[PDB]
């Protein structure tokens, strides 16, 4: 099972977050988003990682009883940008250099882009992710919560930093965030 251990590493790596289409709960460390819509995830570092640094996104099941199962789309949502394979839950929007990878040992999917410097007008680098299947989809996540694990890696795949967040893909992310936050209070 892929580690979800937070690891700021030598570069001080950590994530930040911004009709609601995507909303992040700091209290829950949980992103709520609509199907296939833009999810801006910010990459923050204290110092600039070397040339060739890469950023990988991968989904895992949050519950220990499901951690060994590969997160994939349900059959219905398999059937596009002509780049993300139809089985991949997570895709990147707006990056000409996205790589879609299947682990040969674990069968897990991931998407990698080069680590780029912050865009003009921003103190951080933002990646736009899309989630291609609902949390509730029978045959896919089937109501099981997931984590997205973001790893900062060197050009050879070695770990430089790690952070993570829970995700719910749902039709009414603002309402679902409110319900889960109010339920946490009560
Ligand atoms: Cl659900
Ligand atoms: Mg955090
Ligand atoms: Zn689905």
Residue numbers in the entry: 97 to 114, 121 to 181, 185 to 291
What does the study report here?
The tumor suppressor p53 is inactivated by mutation in about half of all cancer cases. Most p53 cancer mutations are missense mutations clustering in the DNA-binding domain (DBD). Due to its low intrinsic stability, the human p53 DBD is very susceptible to inactivation by destabilizing mutations, resulting in unfolding, followed by rapid aggregation at body temperature. Here, we have systematically analyzed the structural and stability effects of all oncogenic Tyr-to-Cys mutations (Y126C, Y163C, Y205C, Y220C, Y234C, and Y236C) in the p53 DNA-binding domain (DBD).
We have previously shown that the Y220C mutant is an ideal test case for the development of mutant-specific small-molecule stabilizers. This highly destabilizing mutation creates an extended, druggable crevice on the surface. We have mapped key interaction sites in this pocket for designing potent binders and developed a series of small molecules that specifically bind to this crevice, stabilize the protein, inhibit aggregation, and, most importantly, restore p53 signaling in Y220C mutant bearing cancer cell lines. Building on this work, PMV Pharmaceuticals have developed a Y220C-reactivating molecule, PC14586 (rezatapopt), which is currently in clinical trials. The structure of the Y220C mutant in a new, hexagonal crystal form showed a slightly more open state of the mutation-induced surface crevice, due to shifts of the S7/S8 loop around Pro222 and Pro223, compared with the previously determined structure in a different crystal form. These differences reflect the intrinsic plasticity of this pocket, consistent with earlier molecular dynamics (MD) simulations and structures of ligand-bound Y220C mutant. The Y163C and Y205C mutants in the L2/L3 loop region harboring the zinc-binding site were also significantly stabilized, with maximum ΔTm values of 5.6 and 9.4 °C, respectively. Intriguingly, the thermolabile Y220C mutant showed virtually no stabilization by ATO treatment, indicating only minimal, if any, conformational coupling between the mutation site at the far end of the β-sandwich and the ATO binding site. Our data on the Y220C mutant suggest that only partial recovery of the mutation-induced stability loss to a certain threshold stability is needed to restore p53 signaling pathways in cells, which is further supported by a recent study on a DNA-binding impaired mutant showing that partial reactivation of p53 is sufficient for inducing cancer regression. In addition, the Tyr-to-Cys mutation not only creates a cavity but also provides a handle for covalent modification with thiol-reactive compounds, thereby providing additional targeting opportunities, as shown recently for the Y220C mutant.
